[PDB]
Design a protein around this ligand. Structure first.
Ligand SMILES: NS(=O)(=O)c1ccc(/N=N/c2ccc(O)[nH]c2=O)cc1
Length: 294
């Protein structure tokens, strides 16, 4: 727009490209998501306008939605750093446990909110988690049931990511449950602790097999109905579940317990965001402030 001076290309955020921008009338600094024709989908505009009504301190605010120039512009609250950059910045030192715990707690509060309004994130990954200097972390760039795709990229371009995808999705499930977000958040939790991605797949089958190698090949005893899922194959290799103490060391037993419940195969056994908030891991949760180099 003329209304907005692009300051800096922030990223390429899962539907298009995101810029840091200043409103030349009001002066406010925002995130501007650009989505590039043929009168695009009224049904997206309603699940999008729905995203606008999400109101919670741990969810990045969608300020406005502007449809123009054969484009869709989403105007979002701006934060100065994402979790991926923060994790890279502290990869030698580690993120201190109280801060990891604070971040996990806030994100569970955010998901508990979304999920109680029947909204799923669908695309949770470090790059979609934004932090500020006050110790806050916020869910950003929510994905849509369809929107513009579901493409195999934000667009065009570059690096689509399977790393945080729940196994029921990889196994061809049609209807997502809130559980898929808990799985992604579990993967992110592991990654904050170990400073390495938990399941860094290079393809959809490699992603699935990396999960099987770690958590064991699922069967009817641990996940009733799995062998009838659309993409399940009897020919999957049978990997034994490897011991969980090897997964996220040196995380304490409270942390390992909670992670284990967030990574249950069966989406019905997987812990809910609200039940997670009650886990003994959060007995001593506080709100540290990060040291941010902006
Ligand atoms: N320099 S950095 O990589 O850590 C980084 C990354 C993203 C960023 N802002 N991104 C946003 C994305 C979506 C949104 O609704 N708001 C944002 O601020 C601001 C900074």
């Amino acid at each position: 727009m003329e209304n907005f001076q692009k300051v800096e290309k922030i990223g390429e955020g899962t539907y298009g490209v995101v810029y840091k921008a200043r409103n030349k009338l009001t002066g406010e600094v925002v995130a501007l998501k650009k989505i590039r024709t043929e009168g695009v989908p009224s049904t997206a505009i309603r699940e999008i306008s729905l995203l606008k009504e999400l109101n919670h301190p741990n969810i990045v605010k969608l300020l406005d939605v502007i449809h123009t120039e054969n484009k869709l512009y989403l105007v979002f609250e701006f934060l100065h750093q994402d979790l991926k950059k923060f994790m890279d910045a502290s990869a030698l030192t580690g993120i201190p446990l109280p801060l990891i715990k604070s971040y996990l707690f806030q994100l569970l509060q955010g998901l508990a909110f979304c999920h109680s309004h029947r909204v799923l994130h669908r695309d949770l990954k470090p790059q979609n988690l934004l932090i500020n200097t006050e110790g806050a972390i916020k869910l950003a760039d929510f994905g849509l049931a369809r929107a513009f795709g579901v493409p195999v990229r934000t667009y065009t371009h570059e690096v689509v990511t399977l790393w945080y995808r729940a196994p029921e999705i990889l196994l061809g499930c049609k209807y997502y449950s809130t559980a898929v977000d808990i799985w992604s958040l579990g993967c992110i939790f592991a990654e904050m602790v170990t400073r390495r991605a938990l399941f860094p797949g290079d393809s959809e089958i490699d992603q699935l097999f990396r999960i099987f190698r770690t958590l064991g090949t699922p069967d009817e005893v641990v996940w009733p109905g799995v062998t009838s899922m659309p993409d399940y194959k009897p020919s999957f290799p049978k990997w034994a579940r490897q011991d969980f103490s090897k997964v996220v060391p040196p995380l304490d037993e409270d942390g390992r317990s909670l992670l284990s419940q967030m990574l249950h195969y069966d989406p019905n056994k997987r812990i809910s965001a609200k039940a997670a908030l009650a886990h003994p891991f959060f007995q001593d949760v506080t709100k540290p402030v990060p040291h941010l180099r902006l």
